[PDB]
A = this chain, B = another copy of it.
Amino acid sequence: KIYIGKSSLGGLGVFSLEGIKKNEIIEICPTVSICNEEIPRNLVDYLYEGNYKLLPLGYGILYNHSDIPNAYVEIHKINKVTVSNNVMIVYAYNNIQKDDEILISYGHSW
């Protein structure tokens, strides 16, 4: 479904291996719960709310941000330290072509 490559925005990004249609699931990321008193500061702009926060595995952390995003993120609970019973799902906001970079919002808006 997805691959990693150098982004034209710099560093790494997630790309589309094929075509993704609007609202198709792009990736399902397992997550780890990180205790609020223990958050590494360089990870702050990457944790999600389910007392604790969630760190997405898979390529969850690697999606770049954009004011013009083609994807979006939702956190969902799953039927059950190590892995948490939450999951981060990435969906396509529009239709994405092969080898387009997949981009997501800043999360921060009023």
Contacts and interface: CB of A to CB of B under 8 A. Distances in A.
A68 interface: no
A77 interface: no
B12 A62 contact: no
Interface stretch (A15-23, A28-36, A96-104): A28-36
Contacts of A41: 35, 38
A59 B34 CA distance: 17
A57 B11 CA distance: 15
Given A32-B61, A57-B62, A58-B57, A42 B82 contact: yes
Contacts of A60: 57
Contacts of A39: 38, 40
